[PDB]
Amino acid sequence: ADQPMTTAQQLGAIVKSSRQIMRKDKGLNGDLDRLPMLTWIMFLKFLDDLEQMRETEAVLEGKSFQPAIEAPYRWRDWAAIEGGITGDELIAFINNDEAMRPDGTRGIGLFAYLRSLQGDNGGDRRDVIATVFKGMQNRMINGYLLRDVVDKINGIHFNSSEEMHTLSRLYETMLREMRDAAGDSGEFYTPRPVVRFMVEVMDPQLGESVLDPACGTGGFLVEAFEHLERQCKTVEDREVLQESSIFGGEAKSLPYLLVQMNLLLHGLEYPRIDPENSLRFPLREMGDKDRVDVILTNPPFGGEEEKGILGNFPEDMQTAETAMLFLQLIMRKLKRPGHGSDNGGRAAVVVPNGTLFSDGISARIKEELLKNFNLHTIVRLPEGVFAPYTDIAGNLLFFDRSGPTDDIWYYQITVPEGRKKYTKTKPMESHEFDECLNWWSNRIVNQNAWKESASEIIKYSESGQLIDVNLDRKNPNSLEVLEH
């Protein structure tokens, strides 16, 4: 019988006790420094335990195994040995281009090794590990303290990939919270129930490509991958899964590293995450070679882009509003029909009310959307869904590239009785999407769902000038439509 997995309480203890050890290291200043430290250490530990499971699996399947990391650079070589390399010797092994290694031989140091990893066949998990470590550095100065942290993390344990994923989830929650513990009052996060709903209705299929141009710590991409993994029945299916073309963009350092790490731990060979501004490329240079089957995303609800970015967009669509520029990017990146599928690509996009009611340049963007894509469903959510980052209401746009919009289904979810908005401590829950899920493939008008028409929504003057595309439509059954 194998030892039980680390419990949630135990993971918390390890994380807190490690941070408290870090408070003694003069090389580290606050969670700004401590959280990336914990993260690379935790990653090398998780990765090696995963590699053990993969090696074991390959032996059972009579298949060859290729380690991502080779001895003596694996966790089991340098970290897992009681009373192993420590003090100045440890710092040297970590930091140096060349150092005495844990096996008593001189060679390249750990970070230098990880940063110089490269895939055989034109890019694999080793190249992603290298990119991750090129974006991190060891800031601890005291090797005895580093060793002490490594000894705590070494005690983490799991028996399967699923157990590992549970701990990864818990860890990411701790980080976000720590980074919400009155230190950095900010960031933004799509709640899990909203992500799962969006992935469930989008139903990504093995063989499809997926993009999230604002993937954060990778919520949509990881959920998409797990959804894809449930479809595998054969060895061939598994290869398709692991070689999936999965793309992301994320501007924030730690989240950028976290999405790459989690996808690698899920078995994706090459998460393709761009750390720079997703809006920086000329849409007009984009073509079929650039397009994807599925887009799952919660772009920013607000903000403005610098003027240099605007030049990348059509002359009549140069709004500085980030949320609207992302909408154009997403439209551009959907596969056109007749390129592997009949409907072309499909997108699910979280937008604020402002996107819906906006006018001017935004109306032109929405006209283009309605004329060239099928915006078949808009699900409208209660205020508070994104608490505590903002109480603003959210909406989910579902569109594909099949052709122009005709009828648009609206579906409004209401906050449970007696409450007016969700809260951090009382968040929205998955069961609340059940009614919508069942309705999705059995659409009828009712208390929550109604139809609008694109030709009614888009308004032109007699000259044919565009006057309005207002998608902020209210539930005709609601009382706001009754007594205004």
> Domain map of the chain by residue range?
1-159, 160-484
Residue (of 338, 453, 457) closest to 402 by Cα position:
338
Q: From CA 73, how far away is CA 26, in angstroms rounded?
A: 26
Q: From CA 157, how far away is CA 167, in angstroms rounded?
A: 9
Burial 106-124 (b: 16+ CB within 10 A, else e): eebbbbbbbbebebeeeeb
Neighbours of 320 (CB within 10 A): 14
328 burial (CB, 10 Å; 0-12 / 13-18 / 19+) is buried
What phi-psi label fits residue 145: left (phi over 0), alpha (psi between -120 and 50 degrees) or beta? alpha
- Collapsed DSSP state (helix, strand, coil) of residue 297: strand
Residue (of 402, 401, 407, 413) closest to 437 by Cα position:
413
- Collapsed DSSP state (helix, strand, coil) of residue 273: strand
**Residues 268/243, Cβ–Cβ less than 8 Å:** no
Q: From CA 289, how far away is CA 104, in angstroms rounded?
A: 50
- Collapsed DSSP state (helix, strand, coil) of residue 107: strand
**Residues 111/93, Cβ–Cβ less than 8 Å:** no
Max distance between CA atoms of the chain, in angstroms, equals: 84
**Residues 300/352, Cβ–Cβ less than 8 Å:** no
Whose structure tokens read 């969670």? Answer: 31
CA 198, 185, 262 angle in degrees (round to 5)? 45
Per-residue DSSP letter, 210: E
Would you give the distance in Å from CA 433 to the centre of its chain? 21
Q: Which helix (H) or strand (E) segment is 431 a member of?
A: none
Handedness of CA 147, 152, 157, 161 (dihedral sign): negative
Give the residue ranges of DSSP H helices in 99-160: 110-115, 125-134, 143-153
What phi-psi label fits residue 11: left (phi over 0), alpha (psi between -120 and 50 degrees) or beta? alpha
Strand order across the beta sheet in which 210-212 lies: 272-274, 246-249, 210-212, 294-297, 346-352, 394-400, 374-380, 407-412, 449-453
Burial 206-220 (b: 16+ CB within 10 A, else e): bebbbbbbbbbbbbb
Q: Which helix (H) or strand (E) segment is 9 a member of?
A: helix 8-22
- Collapsed DSSP state (helix, strand, coil) of residue 218: coil
To one decimal place, what's the resolution in Å? 1.8
Neighbours of 297 (CB within 10 A): 26
Neighbours of 461 (CB within 10 A): 9
Would you give the distance in Å from CA 123 to the centre of its chain? 21
- How many helices (H) and strands (E) would you count in the chain? 18, 13
**Residues 262/161, Cβ–Cβ less than 8 Å:** no
Q: From CA 96, how far away is CA 112, in angstroms rounded?
A: 7
Q: From CA 40, how far away is CA 45, in angstroms rounded?
A: 9
Cis geometry, peptide bond prior to residue 388 (ω within 30 degrees of 0): yes
According to the entry, how was the structure determined? X-ray
Residue 426 tokens read as: 């009382």
CATH topology of domain 160-484: Rossmann fold (3.40.50)
**Residues 483/456, Cβ–Cβ less than 8 Å:** no
- Collapsed DSSP state (helix, strand, coil) of residue 425: coil
Per-residue DSSP letter, 80: S
178 burial (CB, 10 Å; 0-12 / 13-18 / 19+) is middle
What phi-psi label fits residue 305: left (phi over 0), alpha (psi between -120 and 50 degrees) or beta? beta
Residue (of 479, 432, 436, 471) closest to 454 by Cα position:
471
Q: From CA 358, how far away is CA 363, in angstroms rounded?
A: 7
R_g (Cα) of the chain, nearest Å: 25
Residues 6+ apart with CB under 8 A from 28: 22, 34, 37, 139, 140
CATH topology of domain 1-159: Ferritin (1.20.1260)
Residue 227 to residues 170, 310, 413, Cα–Cα distance (Å): 19, 36, 24
